UniProtKB/Swiss-Prot annotation, chain A:
Record InterPro entries: Rbsml_eL15_core_dom_sf (IPR024794), Ribosomal_eL15 (IPR000439), Ribosomal_eL15_CS (IPR020925), Ribosomal_uL23/eL15/eS24_sf (IPR012678)
Pfam families, per database record: Ribosomal_L15e (PF00827)
Region (Disordered): 164-185
UniProt GO BP: cytoplasmic translation
UniProt organism field: Oryctolagus cuniculus
NCBIfam families, alphabetized: PRK04243.1
Source species, domain of life: Eukaryota
Lipid anchor positions (N-myristoyl glycine): 1
Subcellular localization, as worded in the UniProt entry: Cytoplasm
Keywords: Cytoplasm, Isopeptide bond, Lipoprotein, Myristate, Phosphoprotein, Ribonucleoprotein, Ribosomal protein, Ubl conjugation
Protein's recorded name: Large ribosomal subunit protein eL15
Position of the Glycyl lysine isopeptide (Lys-Gly) (interchain with G-Cter in SUMO2) cross-link: 82
UniProtKB/Swiss-Prot annotation, chain B:
In-chain residues carrying the UniProt-annotated modification Phosphoserine: 28
Any one of the GO CC terms: cytosolic large ribosomal subunit
Its biological purpose: Component of the large ribosomal subunit. The ribosome is a large ribonucleoprotein complex responsible for the synthesis of proteins in the cell.
One Pfam match: Ribosomal_L29
PANTHER family in alphabetical order: 60S RIBOSOMAL PROTEIN L35 (PTHR45722), LARGE RIBOSOMAL SUBUNIT PROTEIN UL29-RELATED (PTHR45722:SF2)
UniProt keyword annotation of Iron present: no
UniProt-listed HAMAP family: Ribosomal_uL29
InterPro entries to which the protein is assigned, alphabetical: Ribosomal_uL29 (IPR001854), Ribosomal_uL29_CS (IPR018254), Ribosomal_uL29_euk (IPR045059), Ribosomal_uL29_sf (IPR036049)
Gene assigned in the entry: RPL35
Positions of crosslink type Glycyl lysine isopeptide (Lys-Gly) (interchain with G-Cter in SUMO2): 24
Domain of life where this protein originates: Eukaryota
Gene Ontology terms: biological process: maturation of LSU-rRNA from tricistronic rRNA transcript (SSU-rRNA, 5.8S rRNA, LSU-rRNA); translation
Region named Disordered: 84-122
Record-given protein name: Large ribosomal subunit protein uL29
UniProtKB/Swiss-Prot annotation, chain C:
SUPFAM superfamilies membership: Zn-binding ribosomal proteins
Role this protein plays: Component of the large ribosomal subunit. The ribosome is a large ribonucleoprotein complex responsible for the synthesis of proteins in the cell.
Statement: the UniProt record of this protein carries the keyword Zinc: yes
PANTHER family per record: 60S RIBOSOMAL PROTEIN L37 (PTHR10768), LARGE RIBOSOMAL SUBUNIT PROTEIN EL37 (PTHR10768:SF22)
Gene Ontology terms, MF aspect: MDM2/MDM4 family protein binding; rRNA binding; structural constituent of ribosome; ubiquitin ligase inhibitor activity; zinc ion binding
Gene Ontology BP annotations: positive regulation of signal transduction by p53 class mediator; translation
Pfam entry (one): Ribosomal_L37e
Binding site for Zn(2+): 18, 21, 33, 36
Record protein name field: Large ribosomal subunit protein eL37
Sorted UniProt keywords: Acetylation, Cytoplasm, Metal-binding, Phosphoprotein, Ribonucleoprotein, Ribosomal protein, RNA-binding, rRNA-binding, Zinc, Zinc-finger
Similarity field: Belongs to the eukaryotic ribosomal protein eL37 family.
UniProtKB/Swiss-Prot annotation, chain F:
Subcellular location: Cytoplasm; Nucleus
Residues modified as Phosphoserine: 5
Record-given protein name: Large ribosomal subunit protein uL23
Biased segments, Basic residues type: 1-29
Reported function: Component of the large ribosomal subunit. The ribosome is a large ribonucleoprotein complex responsible for the synthesis of proteins in the cell. Binds a specific region on the 26S rRNA. May promote p53/TP53 degradation possibly through the stimulation of MDM2-mediated TP53 polyubiquitination.
Comment field on protein domains: The N-terminal beta-like import receptor binding (BIB) domain mediates interaction with IPO5, IPO7, KPNB1 and TNPO1.
Organism for this UniProt entry: Oryctolagus cuniculus (Rabbit)
A GO cellular component annotation in the UniProt record: cytosolic ribosome
Taxonomic lineage from the root: Eukaryota, Metazoa, Chordata, Craniata, Vertebrata
Modification type N6-acetyllysine: residues: 32
RNA sequence: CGCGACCUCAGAUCAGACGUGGCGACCCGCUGAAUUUAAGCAUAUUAGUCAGCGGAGGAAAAGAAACUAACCAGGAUUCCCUCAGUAACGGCGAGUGAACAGGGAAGAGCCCAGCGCCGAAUCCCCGCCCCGCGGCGGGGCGCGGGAAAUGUGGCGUACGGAAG
């Protein structure tokens, strides 16, 4: 199949073939608005993996996120605290720019529900991500029993809660020795158990 | 005149509207009788005419909507008034049909590996 | 002349009756409600005022729709059915 | 301040702990809540074992505990294969499976093979239609002595 | 002022019709506890908001 | 086709009309401000009985959402009469008062007796 | 020059749906102090706590190992008891501080993409007839339309799988 050839060609991003396409498209993407609808997946291959079945109701928005970290919003760099919290410039936002992309695609398209996203280019100033959006109300999705999980009210705004694959990676969850601080539901759920007096009735 | 709802529902479309435009005239005479100063016998009647306007207009408005949701009964697109109001989330649910759709792979698992009624000995 | 005399010049109002929240906190120059924030789609409420929330939440008003939703819940939101007649 | 010979002790109450005090007035109501659900489930899983499916003989890991034996997650796929049970059919007839469990010994393997051999002989299998006893079912006089097994099924003893 | 808005004149219209005493047949009732009208609003003393 | 203008302007594309499969609301909401609900009651005030017997008018209390047009066509239909002009003020009470000046081919005192005030 | 395809971005009171706001105890994602403690104080501590912002649900999140282990080995997640005020962190000061094993509550597993195979075998929608449902679904019947080879559907997913 062609998809395996597109898969391994997309791993040779330093090649003359892909450095032409990742640059000339990255030009084309700057000239477009910061959030616009793409008519198809830029990568038909990558969208296959992340769940994009090319049928009616499946949507792909190409949104760009302004590149760099996060500087602390304080007037004239003055945090009026202790020398630890004096920091502003070299600070980093907890979620990835791919997750910041999905939650603008999903916020703008509130009617739709965000599945996943994939990188399609980066410049000095911007990254570019195709975000896979689904209609929970198109009968193609609303009838297909293996894709009617998004159609239920539990999956409203996955992108906003870190349920999307890009969103999950900011939380620090997974199994084993490295992911103890989010054992239970999350980092918030771990913290609670550990800082709750189980004052038993008898004790 | 005591006006009930039993004896109005058999009456005609043109019949009810004239009885309404008789009670409106009767109530127009009682509102004057409150202002012209006197007749407590009339003042206590104005409620009986106010509520009998509410009886006739109900029987008018009931037979409107009985006919409408009879008209749109077999029709697939009906007005938002006639569609079933439950909670908003309860309208946004999957159908009685769509919940009961299994995939072909899942129908096979139900078929070949059906859940057995079993018991074990001590 | 900062007190008793300065009070005399007060004859032109900053706030008027807001048309969401009804409070006399709709500023005329800023054109925003200091109580609810009217031009803002979202109701202005802050978690630092627990008392200000219980003044203006679901217990305050009629609940003219939401009172019948509680009545209509406990039979299972039934529609179209009427009881058996006489 | 320390008075005399005391213990140099450190209470963990420097946080806002009174907000997060978990009280246990739920406990006697919870024990009834769990028990009512346990009964209502047992009456639902009607002639089946109450405690659930069979769990395999499992050695505890770490040198502290390897002198003891547990109930496991479920039977290994080679414990079912040597026993002659299909991994998709095992779950339906009341046998716990986990694909994760390796077998490093023949001792624990042949013990859990002999476990499934004892289970299937103990098993009473109803027809899927009452008016049609099919070929892979049991006899009517052996179907009327079917009672729910109160306690864990074939309890694993050390 | 003389120059009013329809919303303000409606506001003032309500606060006039609320500024009347109790009917003297209300205190002859069974579960009666009202002596006078506590919310009576004089125009020197309390200045109505706005 | 030649570009006279150095501007590109969006072409006049075709737009169709609403051809809806169902009406949104089922029936039209009836006129709840009738000829009857638009005239509440006449004033039998000493000041108003003067206005009936001196200036040849009738003084009504009207629903606050009525025009001078809506009163004239109400008074014409309710009392089989015609109106010269209507003058409306809203009272300090909040209700609207209509000084309904009748056309001088009708005695307001003889029709004040017809509506049934004394 | 015209005409038909496609691609690409447009406009519509276009046919039909959908999102917005609220509540906010509980839940998820961020952002995030200083009181205070250290008998001062700046790292620490308070504390990833209050406030701020967003998103939900009847629960939420988590979840079927890129795990624990170093045993004769266990086997998703969640919760309870214990481990344990322990290993470890810390002007190694004040203070902070898990995890596995074990005993329980509950217990359930799974689906794709890819790789390939079958003539796209798949899907949404409009017209009429016919049952029929106040969860708009069922059976027809249409050189009726569209999506889709830039990949729909069936088989199949690491426990292997498929074909003969």
């Amino acid at each position: 199949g062609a998809y395996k050839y597109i898969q391994e060609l997309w791993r040779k991003k330093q090649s003359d073939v892909m450095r032409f396409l990742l640059r000339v498209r990255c030009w084309q993407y700057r000239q477009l608005s910061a959030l616009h609808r793409a008519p198809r997946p830029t990568r038909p291959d990558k969208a296959r993996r992340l769940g994009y079945k090319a049928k009616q109701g499946y949507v792909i928005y190409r949104i760009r996120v302004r590149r760099g970290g996060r500087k602390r919003p304080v007037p004239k760099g003055a945090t009026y605290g202790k020398p630890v919290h004096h920091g502003v410039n070299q600070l980093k936002f907890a979620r990835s720019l791919q997750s910041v992309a999905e939650e603008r695609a999903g916020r703008h398209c509130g009617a739709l529900r965000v599945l996943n996203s994939y990188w399609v280019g980066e410049d000095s100033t911007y990254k570019f991500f195709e975000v896979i959006l689904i209609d929970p109300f198109h009968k193609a999705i609303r009838r297909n029993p293996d894709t009617q999980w998004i159609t239920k009210p539990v999956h409203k705004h996955r992108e906003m809660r870190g349920l999307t694959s890009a969103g999950r990676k900011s939380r620090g969850l997974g199994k084993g020795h490295k992911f103890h601080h989010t054992i239970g539901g999350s980092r918030r759920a771990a913290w609670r158990r550990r800082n709750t007096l189980q004052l038993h009735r008898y004790r | 005149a005591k006006i009930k709802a039993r004896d109005l529902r058999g009456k005609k479309k043109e019949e009810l509207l004239k009885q309404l435009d008789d009670l409106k005239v009767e109530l127009s005479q009682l509102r004057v009788a409150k202002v012209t100063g006197g007749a407590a016998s009339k003042l206590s009647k104005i409620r009986v005419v106010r509520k009998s306007i509410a009886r006739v207009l109900t029987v008018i408005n009931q037979t409107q909507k009985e006919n409408l949701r009879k008209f749109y009964k077999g029709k697939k697109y009906k007005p938002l008034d006639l569609r079933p109001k439950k909670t908003r989330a309860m309208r946004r649910r999957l159908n009685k049909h769509e919940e009961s759709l299994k995939t072909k792979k899942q129908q096979r698992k139900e078929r070949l590996y059906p859940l057995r009624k079993y018991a074990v000995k001590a | 002349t900062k007190g008793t005399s300065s009070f005399g010049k007060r004859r032109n109002k900053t706030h008027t009756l807001c048309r969401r929240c009804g409070s006399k906190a709709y500023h005329l120059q800023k054109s925003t409600c200091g109580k609810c924030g009217y031009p803002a789609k979202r109701k202005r409420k802050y978690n630092w005022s627990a008392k200000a929330k219980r003044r203006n939440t679901t217990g305050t008003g009629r609940m003219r729709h939401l009172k019948i939703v509680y009545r209509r819940f406990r039979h299972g939101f039934r529609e179209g059915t009427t009881p058996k007649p006489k | 301040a320390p008075s005399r010979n005391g213990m140099i002790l450190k209470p963990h109450f420097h946080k806002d702990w009174q907000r997060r005090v978990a009280t246990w007035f739920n406990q006697p109501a919870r024990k009834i809540r769990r028990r009512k659900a346990r009964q209502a489930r047992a009456r639902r899983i009607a002639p089946r074992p109450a405690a659930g499916p069979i769990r395999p003989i499992v050695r505890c890991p770490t040198v502290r505990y390897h002198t003891k034996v547990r109930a496991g997650r479920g039977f290994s796929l080679e414990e079912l294969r040597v026993a002659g049970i299909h991994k998709k059919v095992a779950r339906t007839i009341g046998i716990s499976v986990d694909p994760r469990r390796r077998n490093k010994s023949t001792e624990s393997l042949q013990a859990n093979v002999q476990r499934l051999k004892e289970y299937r002989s103990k098993l009473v299998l109803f027809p899927r239609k009452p008016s049609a006893p099919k070929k892979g079912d049991s006899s009517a006089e052996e179907l009327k002595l079917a009672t729910q097994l109160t306690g864990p099924v074939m309890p694993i003893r050390n | 002022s003389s120059h009013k808005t329809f919303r303000i004149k409606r506001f003032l219209a309500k606060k006039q019709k609320q500024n009347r005493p109790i009917p003297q047949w209300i205190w002859m009732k069974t579960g009666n506890k009202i002596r006078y009208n506590s919310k009576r609003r004089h125009w020197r003393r309390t200045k109505l908001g706005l | 086709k030649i570009r006279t203008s150095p501007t590109f302007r969006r072409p006049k594309t075709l737009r169709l009309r609403r051809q809806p499969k169902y009406p949104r609301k089922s029936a039209p909401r009836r006129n709840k401000l009738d000829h009857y609900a638009i005239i509440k009651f006449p004033l039998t005030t000493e000041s108003a009985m003067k206005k009936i017997e001196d200036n040849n008018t009738l003084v009504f209390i009207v629903d606050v959402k009525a025009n001078k047009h809506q009163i004239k066509q109400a008074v014409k239909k309710l009392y089989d009469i015609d109106v010269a002009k209507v003058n409306t003020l809203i009272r300090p009470d909040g209700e609207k008062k209509a000084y309904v000046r009748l056309a001088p081919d009708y005695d307001a005192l003889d029709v004040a007796n017809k509506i049934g005030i004394i």
